[PDB]
Amino acid sequence: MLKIIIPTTMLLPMTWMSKHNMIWINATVHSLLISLISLSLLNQLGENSLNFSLTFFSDSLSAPLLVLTTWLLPLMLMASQSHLSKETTTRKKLYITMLILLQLFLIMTFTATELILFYILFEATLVPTLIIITRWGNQTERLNAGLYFLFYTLAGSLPLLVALVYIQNTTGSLNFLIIHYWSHPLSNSWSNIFMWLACIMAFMVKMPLYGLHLWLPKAHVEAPIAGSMVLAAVLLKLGGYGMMRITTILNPLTNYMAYPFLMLSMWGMIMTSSICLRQTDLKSLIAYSSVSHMALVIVAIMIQTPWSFMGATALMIAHGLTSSMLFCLANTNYERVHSRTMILARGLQTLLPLMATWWLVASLTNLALPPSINLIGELFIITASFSWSNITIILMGMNMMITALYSLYMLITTQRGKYTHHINNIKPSFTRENALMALHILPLLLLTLNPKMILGPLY
C-alpha cells in the first residue's frame, strides 16, 4: 500500500521546491501518475481481501473509493487554477499542500485495518477541509459555515471514540478481520442500544442524515470549488464506508434500531427533493440533491442485504463523480457572473453551446438515466427495499419523479430561454474548463461498461 502513500507524501516537497510558475503543471502531472498507479488496486479477489500488511488492507469496497480519491486531486487543481491567479506563490503552495494532506488522509483512512486508526484519520480529514473552507472562501458566512461543519461532526464522533475503546476492552481487539471472524450477537439491552447509537451516529452525521443535514448546504455554498468537490465527492462517502464496516458487530440489534433512521431517510429524500424545486441558489440546489442521494444510500446500508450493499457502493461512486461535475459547472458560471444566482444568467446555451452539452450530460446522469451507474445503484437499492417492504416503492417513485423534475428545472432555467440583455462579460469557454468536464464525465460512461468494478465486496 506504500507504493501509493509514499508518492503522495513526496508531492509535498516537490510542490514546495517547484518554480513559482510551475506548481500547477508539476502537481497535475504527478497526481495523474499517482492515480494511474492507484488503478492497480482494482484487481481484487472473491476471497477475503488484499491484506498488504498489519496496518493497511484493500477491498473491492475500498478500491473504488481510493481510485476516486486519487483521481479527484488533478481535477481539484485544474478547477482551482482559475480563481487563485492573483495569489502569492506561498499561499498557492499552501493551498496545494492542504489538498495533498487531504488526499493522504483519505488514502490512509480507506485502508485502515484497525478501527482506532480509522477514527484518527477520519477526524484528521477535518483540519485541511476546515482551513480550506475558512481561508479561501469568498463570503463572510464561511467562518460560520466552518463552525457548523466542525461541531456537528465532532458532536457525533466523540461518542464513537468512547464506544470504540470500550469495545477493545471487551472484545480485546479492534482489527477488522478479527472483529468479523469473532463477531457475536448483540443482546437487546439498553447498554447495547446506546453502544449501537454511539457506533452509528458518528457516520450518520457525515452522510448526512435528514435531521442532521444543516451543515452541508452552508459548507458547500461557502467553500471554494475544490472544497465543494472534495466535500460532495469523497467526504460524504466516509460515513457510508464507516457504516458498511461497522454494522457487522451491531447485529441483530440493527433490525429494531434501524426504524427511526429508515423513516428519517425515506421521508427526507422526498423533503430535500422538494426543497430543490424552490431554490434561488445553484450550489444550495446541488447540495440538497447530494443530501437526497445520500439519504437513499443510508436506506440501502440500513436494510443490510447484498443487493443493498452493491447498489450503495455504485451510488456512492456515481454521486461523487456527478456532484463534482455539477459543482464545476456552477463554478464556471459563477466565475463569469460573480453572483451565484440561477435566475440572473439565462439563455446560456445560445452563448456557450458546448458548455450546454456538458450541462445536459451532467443533468441526465444526475437524473439516473439508464444504463448509467447512477441508475444501477438506484435500481439495486430500490429492489432491495421492495424486498424489505413493498410500500417503499411509493416513496422511491416520488423521489425519482421529483429528482427528474428539479434536474431538468436546473438545466432549463440556466441554459434555455432568452439571454440576459445587460450581461455582456460572458467570454468563450476555455480549454481548461472543457477538459475538466470531459475528465469528469468520461469515467462515468466508461464505468457503465464494467459495473462489477464498483459493485463492492458482495458482488
Partner: protein
C-alpha cells in the same frame, strides 16, 4: 439581492415561536415520520407472522 436575501438569510432572525408556527412545525415534521413508521411496522409484522406460519409461498425468492 433583496429577494434572495429575504428568501434565504432573513427567515430565522424574523422567526418568532407562535402557536401557529409551533403546531405547523410539529405536524409537518413529526406526523409523516410516525405515519410511515406505523405503516411499515404493520406491514413487516404481517409479513413476519405469515412467514412464521409458513403460508407465504416464497418459492424462487433467492435474491434479496
Amino acid at each position: 439581492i433583496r429577494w434572495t436575501y429575504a428568501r434565504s438569510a432573513n427567515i430565522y432572525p424574523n422567526f418568532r415561536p407562535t402557536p401557529k408556527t409551533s403546531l405547523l412545525g410539529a405536524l409537518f415534521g413529526i406526523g409523516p415520520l410516525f405515519f410511515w413508521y406505523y405503516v411499515f411496522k404493520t406491514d413487516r409484522d404481517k409479513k413476519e407472522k405469515l412467514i412464521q406460519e409458513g403460508k407465504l409461498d416464497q418459492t424462487f425468492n433467492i435474491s434479496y
